[model samples]
Target: MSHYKSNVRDQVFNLFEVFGVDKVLGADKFSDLDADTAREMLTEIARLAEGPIAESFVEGDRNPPVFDPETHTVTLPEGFKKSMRALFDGGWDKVGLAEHLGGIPMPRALQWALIEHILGANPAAYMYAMGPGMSEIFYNNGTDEQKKWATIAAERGWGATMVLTEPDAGSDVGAGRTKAVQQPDGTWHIEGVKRFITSADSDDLFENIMHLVLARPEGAGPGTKGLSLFFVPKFHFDHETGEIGERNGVFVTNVEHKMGLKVSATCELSLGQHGIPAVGWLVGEVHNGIAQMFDVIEQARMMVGTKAIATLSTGYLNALEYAKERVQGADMTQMTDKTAPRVTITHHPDVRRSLMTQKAYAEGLRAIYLYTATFQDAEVAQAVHGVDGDLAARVNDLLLPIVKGFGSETAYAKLTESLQTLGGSGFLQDYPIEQYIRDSKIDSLYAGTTAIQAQDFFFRKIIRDKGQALAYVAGEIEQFIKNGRLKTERELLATALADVQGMAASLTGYLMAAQEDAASIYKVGLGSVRFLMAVGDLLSGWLLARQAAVAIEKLDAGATGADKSFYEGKIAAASFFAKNMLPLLTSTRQIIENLDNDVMELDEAAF
Candidate 1:
């Protein structure tokens, strides 16, 4: 039996009822796609996710990929290959790609909704299956000759990776010492060592691997601006016929043995040191590397956030299942009666508290990601949120850090509560929570750490954008809250909004104060993470409240059976989060307001 669990009902609720993804799907713009087709597609993928894909998740972990230094090769486990083949053989990977890339046109919300199941079942599979989508990036940015190569790469199922980090430069990508030199044949020779490069190699999984490498030219100035993107492939191929050719200089020097997500081989790639030049084509014959790479980075960040949320959702589902079955104690009301019948752990108040907390973050984080995806396409976003495409783009930009940053942090934290609900059994390999916890730990560290996300959220998304996007989203929540469904939750939402606003003001004030007092900037650093998380909670609470309002109307219209419980859950989770989690913002706001640079002033030897 597979360990993965799914929540298609909630995904559909967010799509049709809450966000109206149907508006764009059935329109003339996306005539080939419709609600029924999309729903069926989601259900189909869910089955694949829960069955075949999840079937090998445990085995893959038990027997991780093997790395051979003799050949500089990494070979994935057979079980892992069978699981990942389930995605590619069925064309599931091209769901969100462009029509030009041999993909079906679907709303980003629906596409991500489908992907959640895969991420939950086996995140490593999703990482290995990123080839088709990455090739689409090549199609978008490549020259006419290279465009053909992108299409061929997608059709031929070539694997891909973004190479940016070096041994000395991880977060500071600009400090990379990798250099490129233009050869006489218009191709550049790339020489550098990049670690933390994911999916760099998989024996027999892909015939070829396309490497999007960032390296500075010999005479370039400095920083990221001086760097350029190169289309480097593991195996050189005929541009027109797409036939395999000579071996490329790119080789997997060493693979990292990591704590979790072990099936995904994290490799150290070396270029031009293997006696063969790592020949690469300049992307679109241009020097704009960082801007171009942001496209992939954003996609990766979204993937990391979604994977974390998916793992958390399954963890909650498993914990909820356990709590309902593990009969070990008497109800709190019957505790005094020693002879009273024992009941399930669900009967305990503390268990209920932990379960509700888990559910709130899992479902609330799902709501956050789906809402963020709705803005990726302008036609749907305009119809759903009344924003133009440009404005929609800005909103998407503003919500990204929250999705990747706050989303990862909350999901990882909440999974612990999920595991605790199962007691010591959760710590054992007999259950999947231990693995979920391990896999989720990397989400915050990669795709940029939570701190990087916090700084980016404030410095770029909000302050640099001049508050237009934030004000729009804030306005939407204001209308949702003031318009009123339940008076109490509304009050909580209002207060939470105020708290978030107050934090924003404090951070902004500190930014302004930096002009005369340089030390004031450090205060913003101290407080930015708190502010980021507070805003995430605010959005989560608001989205849940909006969902609860919809659920309430459905129940009033006579929802019954399993749906009755589901709707009831929506209301209860919303109420619990609004009453409990939202109020903490006030305290957080005070802390942000009182933030200081005392920590920065502390001596290095203080520890």
Candidate 2:
């Protein structure tokens, strides 16, 4: 039996019917691709995800990747390498890249929708095949000569990694001590150790590996502003021929053992520590590193969030399958009669509750990623939401934290529901839920922690952007509430919207009060995560209600079989979430309103 189960029907429904992505397709860069063809591609990738690409999942975990200190190399499992090649070999990795860089032009939403399968099935494989996308990013920010270099790297299908964090610079990236000294050849010598670098070495998975490293120049000022982005390869290569040259000074010094995601090597990269100097070219021949690295960080946060959501989707589907087939106790009404016939867990009230919750978050988070993606394309944002490109970018910025922060936290929590749905059996390796729980946990911790996300959401995304994006999204939620369909859920969504608004006001009020009473800012710190979550829940309820409206129309027209149940499930999940999940926001709003600086003022030694 396969561990991966995909919902192509739901994805397509969300893309074409609910979201109207087809309106943006068959135009501009997407002109060559149509909805029908995209559907075919989705099915193809879904099959690939469920079949060959997922084959090495267990093997990769069992064996994991091996690091050789003497050689400064990593040896991956053969099965993992095979699955990786299968992914890029079909050009699946090239799906959304620019055509100028040998990529297939498609809507960002569709690109992620297509890639969701791979992330759900074998996330390690998806991470290891990061070259083409990273190369595209490199090209986007590179000078003409560097652009040619990046295109060549992408053309050759090399492996890539973003090296940023150091032991001291985990959350405070500005504290990084890595230094790059300028040389006469216009290149720089990067001499420092970077921590938590992924895919730094992938055995022979690719001909070469590209490392986009963050380092400060000699005599540079402190903080991230002084940092510069450098392009450092694992093995030096010819600029024109793309031929692999001598080994570069960058080497994998250490590999961390972890709870899950074992095969995607998390390495400590040492640069210029050996006898040789680690040579690197400044990306775009410019000194603005943090801004340039923001592009990568933003991409990573979205990817991490999607990875967690996709895992939960598979986890929910696995639990759903189990509940339908695993029979145990009798129905609740038959509790008094032991001799009564047994029933599947789905017949139980509590099991149904758990399943519904799992379903709601899984689908809701899916919508989060997809909805946020709409703003990723200027034209798509215009067609879908009537926002200009500039506003679209801000909206994308606003939603990313929700998609990454809220999505990660919710997905990881719901996956536990998925595991418990199977009772003790879920703990066994025979099922994938245990691994899903372990693997998805990293989503919240990486890219940015949930706490970090809350701060970024409140201070940077919302406050710095001056609430324009927040206002636009709130307007959408408000419009949905007034749309008049799913009448009961509308009131529920309306309350949630107000609750979210209250949270926003409470935080902003704290920010304003900070001018006179500095301690008021601490309350904002304490309340931001709750605010982030409330907004996320409000959006979730609103979207689910929107889905319920569309599903009800389909129901009124009378569909049956699989279509009927899917649509029916949509309505049940929506109502269940609105009635059950949305009310919690009201409580959260009160908590945010009543926040204090007690925790921030507590003595350091009290614990």
Candidate 3:
């Protein structure tokens, strides 16, 4: 009925019935989150997300924001602001924040589930409204005084921006030329131009905007390790009372016009050029800025991934609804029969094929993120993987890249099929599919590109951990396959599982050999993205199949109505992914195993 077509009931089923979040809630770490409360929160958030929060899906894109360079202001579409208010008024921003800051602590899975609806319905709207979450990062890394500022920023609903990218140093954080010099007072003066800063300026969005800045301190060493984080705000506020004071030196010099997410206010922020020194304080009052910034960067990566997955989910659902209703040509088998009765496009094999592919990646990626979230819940970890809190944290770290990398790449690729299923109408703004494509395109680019994710996945997650976390998760999957709960679909899932295990072994072997031959490392780098994706597919297949088994048990116990369709869809989607989608891993595995350095060896002037 709306641009957002997520099956909320099914999401609940996955959380409560299938994933057994209730079981986790019973544990000590999550004892505060009872099943009833969790269900109510999920349902209410879904209602709001599909309703008022989604109202500007098409309107915002059709009439995007207009930037006034002189005033350094971005005037958002009127409807977009109304939709943003819907999200703010609902306290959706406070769902997962720390308890001290007036947030209700919840599992990451539940938090992201609600986020998916907002992200899918209106991704730009969601991105524009992430100030509270950004402030949370500040809270974690800020000094004692700055932590209070972070709380104030959250409580007062202030806008926030992470200033990192410059015109030249995009992926290289160490290359930022922004300089931070200490003033006569203990405060620091920031003087630099920051490009691609989101939510840098918004009229009346907040009394002030907090800029989490990354700048090279005077006389610091080279590289990211030398760079330090500064808390700079658009306005100087009273630190004691958290009250509004005077406008600070930082001003939005210009706003960027982008291919998508125009409402996000990607601004060119100029510091200290407006005759007022941009005053700032060092975050955490420590020199470990990159380490502190990693907290923000990692959170952004996960959010970007979830945003991409959410957009793809809604895109697929919209396409599926259209295919099921629109009458087209006769079935493929009746190609010669001009008089044959017309049927829905879904009846055609090709349409079905496309829909299944979309469904596989959409729901598959959802499962991956949710599974990653499960590890973050201490109780879930103890119950599911038998890991204590410490190992659970490591497990969460290990899977973040997978969730961020595979989720963004696969979601973007599959959304193309969703748009193609709509044919030419998909290209028009009348449908949200085109906007979904446009909005999701930035996920891969931001929060570390695919190559960055691939390298992190190989060197940091796997090699650094020495495969302990990876082996633990893989062991869980192996146990599930041999547990016999999925007797009906065992053979299909077992085959898929074997392919993943084989790929993992092959890749691990290659990484080991890279120690002897440095060039062999490039082969791993070339194929690491594919390996990461394969891991994603494997995890998705295992989780979905496990879900199917749970659905079957519930169905046998006589579930009825929507629950029945929900369960049936789970079973069908699982079988669909395992049979049709997972087989592709055989080819992907081969590509990774036989990956070469031909691309790397190419001459610079070959063209």
Could you tally the backbone clashes for each prediction?
A: 0, 0, 1
Ranking by lDDT: 1, 2, 3
Tens digit of lDDT per residue, candidate 2, span 1-607? 3799999998998999899999977898789999999999999999999988888878888899999999888999998888888898789878798898788899999999988999999998888877889999999999999998999999888889989999999989999999999999899999999998989888888899999999999999999899999999888888988888999999899999999999999999999999888999999999999999889999989999899999999999999999999999999999999799999999999999999999999998898899999999999999988999999999999999998899999999999999999999999999999988888889988888999999999999889999999999999888877754588998888888998899999999999999999889889888888888888888888888788888988889998999999999999989999999999988899988998888888899996
On lDDT, the candidate that comes out on top is 1
Give the per-residue lDDT digits (tens) of candidate 1, residues 111-201: 8999999999999999888998999998899899889999999988889999999988888889998999999889999999999999998
Evaluate model 2: give its TM-score: 0.99
Worst lDDT 10-window in candidate 2 = 477-486
Q: How accurate is candidate 3 locally (lDDT)?
A: 0.82
Instruction: By TM-score, rank the candidates, best first.
Output: 1, 2, 3
Over 4 Å off in model 1, which ranges? none
Candidate 3 residue pairs in clash (backbone atoms < 3 Å): 143-284
Q: Where does model 2 exceed 4 Å of error?
A: none
Query: For model 3, how big is the CA root-mean-square deviation?
Result: 2.1
Models 1 onward score TM values of 0.99, 0.99, 0.95
Clashing pairs in 1: none
The per-model lDDT (C-alpha) reads 0.92, 0.91, 0.82
- List candidate 3 stretches off by more than 4 Å: 24-33, 484-489, 492-495, 505-516
